[PDB]
C-alpha cells in the first residue's frame, strides 16, 4: 500500500525492502480481528453465552474495544518505562558492598564447578 510508504516517511526510513508493508498490514489485520472478536464476546456478556438463554445482537461501542485491548496489553506491547520499579529494585541490588579485593594483575575466574571447561561434549 502506498499509504504505508507515506507512513514510513514519518520516521526517515526510505530504504524498505517491499516485504515489510505486506507483513505489517497482515499483522494489523490479525491483531484487529482478535481484538474486535473478544470485544464482541464482551458485548454478548453485557447482554444477559450459555446453551440457549437469549439472543446475540451487536452494537460494539468503544468501551468493549478498550476492554479487549487492555487484556492484550496485559501480556504484550512494551509498556511505559517502568522507572520506579527499576529504581527501587536496583537500590535493593545497589546495597551490598563490592568485594574490595586484589587478584594481583591477571583475571580472576569463578571457581571450577562454576566455570565451563568447554571440552568436546561426550557421554
Amino acid at each position: 500500500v502506498r499509504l504505508l510508504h507515506l507512513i514510513f516517511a514519518t520516521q526517515n526510513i526510505y530504504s524498505y525492502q517491499d516485504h515489510v508493508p505486506l507483513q505489517l498490514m497482515d499483522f494489523a489485520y490479525r491483531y484487529t480481528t482478535g481484538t474486535l472478536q473478544d470485544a464482541t464476546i464482551y458485548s454478548d456478556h453485557a447482554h444477559a453465552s450459555n446453551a440457549g438463554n437469549a439472543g446475540t445482537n451487536a452494537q460494539l461501542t468503544t468501551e468493549d474495544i478498550r476492554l479487549a485491548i487492555a487484556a492484550r496489553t496485559n501480556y504484550q506491547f512494551k509498556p511505559v518505562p517502568p522507572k520506579e520499579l527499576l529504581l527501587e529494585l536496583a537500590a535493593e541490588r545497589n546495597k551490598k558492598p563490592l568485594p574490595a579485593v586484589i587478584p594481583t594483575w591477571g583475571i580472576r575466574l569463578p571457581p571450577e564447578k562454576y566455570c565451563l571447561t568447554g571440552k568436546d561434549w561426550v557421554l
Binding site: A51, G52, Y75, Q76
Partner: protein
Amino acid sequence: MEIQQMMFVSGETNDPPVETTSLIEDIVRSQVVEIVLHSSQTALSRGTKSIVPEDVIFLIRHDKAKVNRLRTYLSSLKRLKTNDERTKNMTKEEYVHWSECRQASFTFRKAKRFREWCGLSHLAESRPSDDVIDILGFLTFEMVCSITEEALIVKMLEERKHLFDGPDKDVRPITSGHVLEAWRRLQKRNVEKKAIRNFQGGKLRSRVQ
C-alpha cells in the same frame, strides 16, 4: 446425574454425595457442548448443516479411535485385565450390578432427554441423528470412567467396646478437590508436544477429555 453416579460406580468406587455428581454433570455437559461446537463449525466450513460421525471420530483423532469404532460396529491391557481378575466374585448379586451401569447409559433409550438437557438451540435449521447420540453416550461414559480413575489415584497418592451406632459401613473417598486435581491432571495441557513453542509469551487454547 443419576446415570453419572451409576457410571462412577461402574468405574470403581461408591458413595458420591450430590456435590461431586452435579459437578461431574457440569463437566460432561461442557465437554460435549465443546465437541459439538467444533464438529458443527468444521462441517459448515465444509459446507453442510447435518452433523455426521466421520468428523467426530477424527475430532478425537487419537488412540481414542479403536474403542469408539467397536461401540459403533456393535450397534497397559494387562493392568485392565489384572484389576478385572481381582474383581472376579459373586453374592448379593455381585456381577449383576456391573451390567446395570453398562446398559443404563443415556444412549440406551432416553436419547430425548439426553439431547435436550445438553445444548440443542445450536443448529436450529437441522437436527442430528440418534447414531451420534449413542456416540456421545460412549464418550460421556469413557470420560466419567477416566475422571474416576484419576480421582482414586490422587486419593491413594495422598495416603474399646463399640458404641453400636457407628454402622462401620460408611466411607468418604471422593469430593470436589480430588476431581479438581484430576481434571487439572487430565488437562495435561497438550502432550506438551503441542506446546513446544517453548520460548515466547502469551497463550490460549481449549481442550477435551
